[PDB]
């Protein structure tokens, strides 16, 4: 009887805010959260209370603490079976990790359409506004092991895995709506010249280093995504708060044989939101599992992920009307040129039970595509068509993957492939081959039809030679990154200049920087200007003379570009550091907590050590975290209550606690004699905006700090942000 | 896409300082660094320059830059097999990493003792002070992936391979002289409980979180390895400034028979150094791989790692002559009764060429032992040695591991063993078994001896029955942890209780929290009250009065457990930054500069921008980093020179410098107009002791601030740095 008698040991199986309960496997903290997947799970969940320990092979054991020996303290003997498995077992737990894409974060949802889309598509999975879809989605970054971090600037991953009853779909995406390269035949340079350099593994989870940028300045196709990757679209708040693309143009087909060509799109229903720089390297160190984190604490909370699925869609006949070849997956099809059509909207609802077996083994796929989807010839797509099974071989252990409880299709699934390492399933039928007599040809084929029916390909004409050769339609590489650049807000557009600077201040050879700055004079004169003055870098006479490239069809810019210039804010699921002292108002307290809760924003009560204290009511406060041990870095806003501020105004770590969310942009309010700390962040008298302050936090002080914290940040502090020694 | 005309792509092959050129492969470095099993992987070097680019096949490839398709827009075709060898060995590149210890930093070096020890043992490595040992070492964190970051709180590990010419002798050890557990059965609980979380994963590279609390609270003998943990040593400054152990007690035989117990150990010849908490931590954010990097660099330079390998040595009959076991691996012994003998010097001097060949695919293991060394009944040492054979079969694919280059032995090696995946030796010996009279029984058993001897183990007397037990001599837990504790400075034993506040702070479950606390104070109630205080917990009468336990055979200290209490300081290798302005008086940075270079501590210099400043004399500087881009956590200590202060005084970046690197205990020196950066760090016309500051920087001003940095922190300043915002 080792656990606590009063039952704290274990969280309540209910939904409950960040940091108030322990975490907990889904199936225990939602026992009563069920789809069809995940009931179809139930046959591998394995329990534990009230069980024997055993063995593997069903053996009790006696003494878990002990090896066998002759005499307590003579040698091992090789008779301990049970130690032997114990640590076998150990010493073979890890599996290679994914090539790229190695950190993630998943959770299970469901999908449903809006309706029937029959009319352009197919796809069961999209026939009826009625029929879920259970899914299973990870987020990921790109660069970085398993064991890195979560909020580095990089490409972030979103893949779908589908559970349709017609097989599985994967929408394998990423945030941004297009890709650093063309070809698949080069996806291995991109890759070693991003990854950590060969001599000596270093630098993790960073494109900071010279061979990525030697790679870029050398393939300009890669421009337009790195514009995408220096923005603030590189450090996301939160995988709730990125969009998401399936970048390639694919096809849809209906019942009728037509073919639409279609891009992919997801919409955060939260909106979107990043970090800044600073901010998110500073994380990286004090909380490398934050996004990872968010996401679980969003689902135990009940503030579940959703995304709204959208389609860009152009008619066959349309494949030519672009300035940019629809097939180029370095190129965007702007959304003021073909709107996205909103399609049907994915929830999150549960965590995993267990984070190995159902992430690290989960298997997607871009080529698994279900009867009413297609390819098209995007020839980054056509190559991944061929990475993503055999990486499985070697990653998961053999072809039997698909047989790995996560990736199991809930729909039926027969065929005469038989063996291969860790084969679950027995096959009973006579016949191994087909065409057979001895099994009446079953399992038989089926037609291609409107449902129900076998896949046939879409008879797309081709003609060419057998080249090698990249079409000349591909080559083209300023435009994209200057429209997406003429989109972004000012202050987006400073963070993009800031990018660029920090990254190429760490390549060491200067003349790739040099090469780099080069390349952004053939995308905005002003960029590249602004940039080269933080390196110490004087652009020449011809440098300043390079003529910008065209605009996209007529566009010179599209705001839907931009994380921020048309408000999405959305502000249930955020959370606000209270900075608490030895005698707070406790009517501050009531009105600040209360109107939190009421728009489903979260708090953590902070102080200079744990337990408790005491309000002046004699009210009860338990301390969630340390000023030191919950950095402003991990909350969006930060509020302070009246009370004795003498308790922690000569507190350093109090102080730069409001020094560092101030530099970083984020809603500060202060109540009562807590503007005392006004003089720490230097602010007038008369106030400023984006600094919350009254004699209490009654009245309209929290509908204002509300405010400030749907719009994010405090975009107009930036330039007194320089100043501060923080 | 060519090399820059000047030859600047390419860094010189001389020793250079940190920073000065890109690093690089280490026989492109070093050509000239050489040693017998630096040589003997010359058959598998491959080197690049001037051939062809081919197919694995040696086949030509024309266009690496695009896959073959049927017209330049059409579908990729299955014929394209460069495209999918290119492909295929990208998709396999993943090995699984190592369960534990999977992050870590290897380099290539020698070893040689300083006299024959033929009269303790007749290992050939240590016969002869004239016969150099290649040698390959590791060091590595525990908890971590090879993905996550250096500076993290964590035991480190510190593991040689010793080429020797009667085989190979990996010498397997820590950087604490003692581990968390007794009995090699329990490490898969303990290494579970310390690792990431099962349901979601988190936290990587932390034992901050309320598993591993949990099995500490639950098994007292983690407390002594816990307490090392929890003190700076848990946060070394270097790989370079930290001891090693081998920490299970082994034999030396010699060539009359006679057994003498044996524990190993390495002495920094850099000295002992750590970080501070907050530095480590953000460190991990700034620059996750600051030990990687900082040990290449560190090899670059010519301040190779040297280590003193020493031995604690026991004749037989004093086995059981102190107040513990000596086969407890929880239980150290003190110097102060058993002294360390100064056996040989070890010199890490070149770095690999490729991570992944040599050091991701590095096998060590402490099984693998020579003729006069020999084990002991320790129950931890026992159960590794069926650990470390074992996991190589899936991390390195077969049990060919060892023809892998960088593992195999430069002496000879013949047995009747065949076959196994990936074999590369092709034997020929007609006979495969013995005795075989078709070979003439070759390769044949060779006598045990003197010298060039086959292997026999010490016939130690065994008398016992079969038992799974503990040995009640094992069953004591808190008189090491105590000694532990009463050796530290009062500095460091704040920093110790420090270490537990803030990671029990990261316990969710508070009885997990009030345990521990319980636990402290049975090794020390100053202690106990002192994390209690930081917790909110106020101990029990029954609390105040537990016993202390016994001091350890007499002793009440032993300073040899502290870092810092007995000075060993050495700058060399150390690195200053030196922060310019756009005017440097270079009067000032001469000075700085040649007394820098006295005493081989580097430069680096730091500016708000990149590319150059010039001086007051037209001497023009360039310029390593920004202010933001190596913070101050990367360096030992900051020098400001005189010039146009003006044009950095309100620099938040700069300010803000000197206020991190204030906290974090280094030494700071002003020269001229820069004095008036006082204000910043709040402090005393008078001066403090800590600041340097002097009209210019001269000889005088120098030796004052090399003096501060030989003794590596300015642990006085601790009192004064709780108010500072930063
Ligand atoms: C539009 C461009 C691409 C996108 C959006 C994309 C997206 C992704 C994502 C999101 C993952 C992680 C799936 C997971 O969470 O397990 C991943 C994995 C992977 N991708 Fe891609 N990818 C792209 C291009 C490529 C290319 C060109 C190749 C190679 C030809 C490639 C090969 C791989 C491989 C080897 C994995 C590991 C897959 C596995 O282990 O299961 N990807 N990719
Ligand atoms: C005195 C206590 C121990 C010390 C000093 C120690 C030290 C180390 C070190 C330094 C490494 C990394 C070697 C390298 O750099 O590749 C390592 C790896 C490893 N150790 Fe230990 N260890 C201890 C206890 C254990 C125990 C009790 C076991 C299991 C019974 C164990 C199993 C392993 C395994 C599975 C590896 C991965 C080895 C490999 O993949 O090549 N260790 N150990």
């Not at 301990?80 to 640590?87: Q, T």
């Not at 017609?166 to 063309?182: H, K, M, R, S, Y």
């Not at 009446?440 to 089926?446: G, L, S, V």
Request: charged share 25%; proline share 8%; with cysteine.
């Amino acid at each position: 009887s080792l656990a606590p008698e009063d039952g704290s040991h274990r969280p309540a199986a209910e939904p409950t805010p960040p940091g108030a309960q322990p975490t907990a496997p889904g199936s225990l903290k939602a026992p009563d959260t069920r789809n069809e997947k995940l009931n179809s799970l139930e046959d591998v969940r394995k329990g534990s209370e009230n069980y024997a320990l055993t063995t593997n092979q069903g053996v009790r054991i006696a003494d878990d603490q002990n090896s066998l020996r002759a005499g307590s303290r003579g040698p091992t003997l090789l008779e301990d079976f049970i130690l032997r498995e114990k640590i076998t077992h150990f010493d073979h737990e890890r599996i290679p990790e994914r090539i790229v894409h190695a950190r993630g974060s998943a959770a299970h949802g469901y999908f449903q359409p809006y309706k029937s889309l029959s009319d352009i598509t197919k796809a069961d999975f999209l026939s009826d506004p009625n029929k879920i879809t259970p899914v299973f989605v990870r987020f990921s970054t790109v660069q970085g092991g398993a064991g890195s971090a979560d909020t580095v600037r990089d490409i972030r991953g979103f893949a779908t895995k589908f559970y349709t009853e017609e097989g599985i779909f994967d929408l394998v995406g990423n945030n941004t709506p297009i890709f650093f390269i063309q070809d698949a035949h080069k996806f291995p340079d991109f890759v070693h010249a991003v990854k950590p350099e060969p001599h000596w593994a270093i630098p993790q989870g960073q494109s900071a280093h010279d061979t990525f940028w030697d790679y870029v300045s050398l393939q300009p196709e890669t421009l337009h995504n790195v514009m995408w990757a220096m923005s603030d679209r590189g450090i996301p708040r939160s995988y709730r708060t990125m969009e998401g693309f399936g970048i390639h143009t694919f096809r849809l087909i209906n019942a009728e044989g037509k073919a639409t060509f279609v891009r992919f799109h997801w919409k955060p229903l939260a909106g979107k939101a990043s970090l800044v720089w600073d901010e998110a390297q500073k994380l990286t160190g004090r909380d490398p599992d934050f996004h990872r984190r968010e996401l679980w604490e969003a689902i135990e909370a009940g503030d579940f992920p959703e995304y709204e699925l959208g389609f860009q869609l152009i008619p066959e006949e349309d494949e030519f009307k672009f300035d940019f070849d629809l097939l180029d997956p370095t190129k965007l099809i702007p959304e003021e040129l073909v709107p996205v059509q909103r399609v049907g909207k994915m929830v999150l609802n549960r965590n995993p039970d267990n984070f190995f077996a159902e992430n690290e083994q989960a298997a997607f796929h871009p080529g698994h595509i279900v009867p009413g989807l297609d390819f098209t010839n995007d020839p980054l797509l056509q190559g991944r068509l061929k990475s993503y099974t055999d990486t499985q071989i070697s990653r998961l252990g053999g072809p039997n993957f698909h047989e790995i409880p996560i990736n199991r299709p809930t729909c039926p699934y027969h065929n005469f492939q038989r063996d291969g390492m860790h084969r679950m399933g027995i096959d009973t039928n006579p016949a191994n081959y087909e065409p057979n007599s001895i099994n009446d040809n079953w399992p038989r084929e089926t037609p291609p039809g409107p449902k129900r029916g076998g896949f046939e390909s879409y008879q797309e004409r081709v003609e060419g030679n057998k080249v090698r050769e990249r079409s000349p339609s591909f080559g083209e590489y300023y435009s994209h990154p200057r429209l997406f650049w003429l989109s972004q807000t000012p202050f987006e557009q400073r963070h993009i200049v800031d990018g660029f600077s920090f990254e190429l201040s760490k390549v060491v050879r200067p003349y790739i920087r040099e090469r780099v700055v080069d390349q952004l004079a053939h995308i905005d004169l002003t960029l590249a200007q602004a940039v080269a003055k933080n390196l110490g870098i004087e652009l020449t006479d011809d440098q300043l003379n390079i003529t910008p490239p065209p605009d996209v069809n007529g566009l010179k810019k599209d705001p839907s570009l931009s994380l921020y210039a048309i408000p999405d804010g959305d502000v249930k699921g955020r959370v606000v550091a209270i900075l608490l002292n030895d005698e707070v108002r406790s009517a501050d307290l009531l009105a600040i907590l209360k109107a939190l809760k009421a728009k489903g924003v979260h708090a953590k009560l902070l102080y200079s050590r744990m337990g408790e204290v005491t309000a002046d009511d004699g009210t009860v406060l338990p301390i969630a975290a340390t000023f030191a041990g919950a950095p402003s870095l991990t909350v969006d806003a930060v509020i302070v209550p009246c009370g004795n501020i003498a308790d922690i105004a000569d507190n350093g770590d109090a102080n730069y606690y409001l020094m560092e969310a101030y530099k970083h942009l984020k809603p500060i309010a202060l109540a009562g004699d807590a503007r005392k700390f006004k003089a720490t962040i230097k602010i007038a008298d008369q106030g400023e905006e984006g600094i919350v302050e009254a004699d209490s936090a009654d009245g309209s002080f929290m509908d204002e700090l509300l405010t400030l914290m749907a719009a994010h940040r405090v975009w107009s502090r930036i330039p007194k942000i320089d100043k501060i020694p923080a």
